[PDB]
């Protein structure tokens, strides 16, 4: 898993791989590592496959019940605090999950990050997973706040690829999203092997 996401002038772009390996055996190659929480939030997945898919389905239930009672959308500062209070409550139960929430509330963008130990941090630039250390060096070299929409989609798709190429626990099909003010759109969905003969023809 090499999930990353960054925040810039124009919204938030989320970019993942799609590989689930139980050690040296690859279990699957079409894993959706972005659970869309609703039509203006996103959540990402790293670590345990069942620990992420359970509690972000619990998180998608607490966000839907917010809109039923209060009649309005949930913020992202409330959405991660739901996920961080759940996570800190089970910190001695051996959970393994590292998740980013990204969305457009009424205060603009916000890109948070929740551990499996109850941490919650607020930056504009993350890269999580076992192969994330490869995705920093190509992203920190080319990141700037005022990127265009097409170049930041190119920087995200290219920064996943150089970590899927080097880490054994990362790879598959690079999925790029874009969180603008009206919600999120699936930008592209392409194989890593097809993406090698584009970047090095």
């Amino acid at each position: 898993t090499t999930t990353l996401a960054f925040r810039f002038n124009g919204g938030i772009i989320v970019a993942v791989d799609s590989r689930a390996s139980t050690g040296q055996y690859i279990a699957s190659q079409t894993v959706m590592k972005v659970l869309e929480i609703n039509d203006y939030l996103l959540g990402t997945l790293a670590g345990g496959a069942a620990d992420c898919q359970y509690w972000e389905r619990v998180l998608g239930m607490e966000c839907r019940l917010w809109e039923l009672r209060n009649g309005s959308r949930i913020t992202v500062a409330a959405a991660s605090k739901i996920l961080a209070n759940i996570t800190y409550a089970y910190r001695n139960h051996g959970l393994s999950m590292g998740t980013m929430v990204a969305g457009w509330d009424q205060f603009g963008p916000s890109l948070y990050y929740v551990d499996d130990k109850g941490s919650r941090v607020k930056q504009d630039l993350f890269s999580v997973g076992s192969g994330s250390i490869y995705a920093y060096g190509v992203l920190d070299t080319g990141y700037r706040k005022d990127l265009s929409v097409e170049d930041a989609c190119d920087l995200a798709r290219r920064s996943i690829f150089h970590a899927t190429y080097r880490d054994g626990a990362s790879g598959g099909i690079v999925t790029v999203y874009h969180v603008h003010e009206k919600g999120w759109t699936k930008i592209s969905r392409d194989d890593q092997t097809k993406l090698y003969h584009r970047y090095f023809p």
Binding site: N92, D115, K117, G118, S119, V121, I133
Partner: protein, 206 residues
Amino acid sequence: MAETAIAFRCKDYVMVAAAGLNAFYYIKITDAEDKITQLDTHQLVACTGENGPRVNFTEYIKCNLALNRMRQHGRHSSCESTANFMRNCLASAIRSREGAYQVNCLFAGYDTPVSEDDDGVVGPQLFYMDYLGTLQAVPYGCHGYGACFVTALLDRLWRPDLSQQEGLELMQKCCDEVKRRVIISNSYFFVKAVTKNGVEVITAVH
């Protein structure tokens, strides 16, 4: 312990400084994260530790000081009453189900007379704490890896009659020693100060 907190009190101010480093086992997540939580208008705490228990301990302390100002008609409690409420939460957590808070903190504050009948403390307050529940009022306290570099630095250079600028150039020497010997990259230090007019965020020393 990878991140240091440095605090010393003087005649009419208390300096605090806490490195804003947040890491994932060797990877720098941030460099500017505020770790000095403003509890009251004249009180703050500089907690160190990992980011899990550190927010959840400070939010429990801060929301209970505010609740004790709701139920008591906006009357601000003393700095010793806040500090003794804090170590009650450390000491009752080392003998509980969920486990001990892994937070090391330095409480700081200034005591003002709330009315004309108050004849309590007028001066500044600075309290050393621990993750177990140790509490000690101390002239200067330090946590982290670089604590022992700078506690013996303040053995050399701290004076009780330091001014606002003389203690400002002392804290600059405190921040430059941690950059010199500690292998952990602490580059931005978040210097704040507590005076008779409240808290203030010092921009110069970083």
